[PDB]
């Protein structure tokens, strides 16, 4: 079973947004619009914006899940490697096996799907802070793309779904992720490769 990755704005005009963080060697998280790909360091804060055209109902939630991008792997559950799942870096809420965490939200819930065994983290959808136009969720990715016995150099996608209180689909967006030591350099490289290709 592979979760859908079809972009779907839905009734509320749901879509993601990303900051413009640049590609300096020191940058810890940076998004490439050309590649639709986020590059980030291990366990560092990744701001992801939520934008809507109209207010979803109270009880709406926002779920994040990782899948493998490549066809021959998409069927395999994305999880932390055998080292990182045992390094006791728990925040008290996230299971140690989960790749994706939400940082600094006490209402975050972590799901191990009883049928697909896939992991996800879900939070309530909330309106922007006074003065802002969108809401920001802070994600952490808790393994490197290169982790042996884990992602093992396989590219992943994060799928973000807007859900009603029952879990029914209201909206969907997605982006590729590379968790790496030097996001700035890697983004610059992959953008250059694309331009040549
Ligand atoms: C520019 C003026 N229009 C856009 C055309 C509105 C701006 C105000 N927002 C309110 C709003 C509510 C929720 C929520 C919730 C749970 O009930 C989540 C988000 I992100 C959010 O932006 C709605 C859109
Ligand atoms: Zn790992």
**Resolution in A for the shown PDB structure?**
1.6
For residues 158 and 145, the answer to whether their CB atoms sit within 8 Å is: no
Structural domain count of the chain: 1
**Which of helix, strand or coil describes residue 186?**
helix
Q: What domain range includes position 179?
A: 1-197
Mutate to test the pocket of ligand 1, among 49, 127, 173 (most ligand atoms within 8 A of CB): 127
- List the one residue out of 59, 138, 50 whose CA is nearest residue 100: 138
Q: What is the CATH number of the domain that holds 83?
A: 2.60.40.720
8-state DSSP, 42:
T
Measured torsion, CA atoms of residues 60, 64, 65, 67, in degrees rounded to the nearest 10: 120
Method: X-ray
Buried b (16+ CB within 10 A) or exposed e, 78-117: bbbbeebbeeeeeeeebeebbbbbbbeeeebebeeeeeee
Which ligand gives the minimal distance to the CA of 123? 1
Annotated binding site for Zn(2+): 81, 84, 143, 147
Give φ, ψ of 85 to 5 degrees: -65, -15
User: Measuring from atom 15 of ligand 1, which residue has the nearest CA?
Assistant: 126
């Amino acid at each position: 079973s592979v979760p859908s990755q079809k972009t779907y704005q839905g009734s509320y005009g749901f879509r993601l947004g990303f900051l413009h963080s640049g590609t300096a060697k020191s940058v810890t998280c940076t998004y490439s619009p050309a590649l639709n790909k986020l590059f980030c360091q291990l366990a560092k804060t990744c701001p992801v914006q939520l934008w809507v055209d109209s207010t979803p109902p109270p009880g709406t939630r926002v779920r994040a899940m990782a899948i493998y991008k490549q066809s021959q792997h998409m069927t395999e559950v994305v999880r932390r490697c055998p080292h990182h799942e045992r390094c006791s870096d728990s925040d008290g809420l996230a299971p140690p096996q989960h790749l994706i965490r939400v940082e600094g939200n006490l209402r975050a819930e972590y799901l191990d799907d009883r049928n697909t065994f896939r992991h996800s983290v879900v939070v309530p959808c909330e309106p922007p802070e006074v003065g802002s136009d969108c809401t920001t969720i802070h994600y952490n990715y808790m393994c490197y793309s290169s982790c042996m016995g884990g992602m093992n150099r396989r590219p992943i996608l994060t799928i973000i779904t807007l859900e009603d209180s029952s879990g029914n689909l209201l909206g969907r967006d997605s982006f590729e992720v590379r968790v790496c030591a030097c996001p700035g350099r890697d983004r610059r490289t992959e953008e250059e490769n694309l331009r040549k290709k």
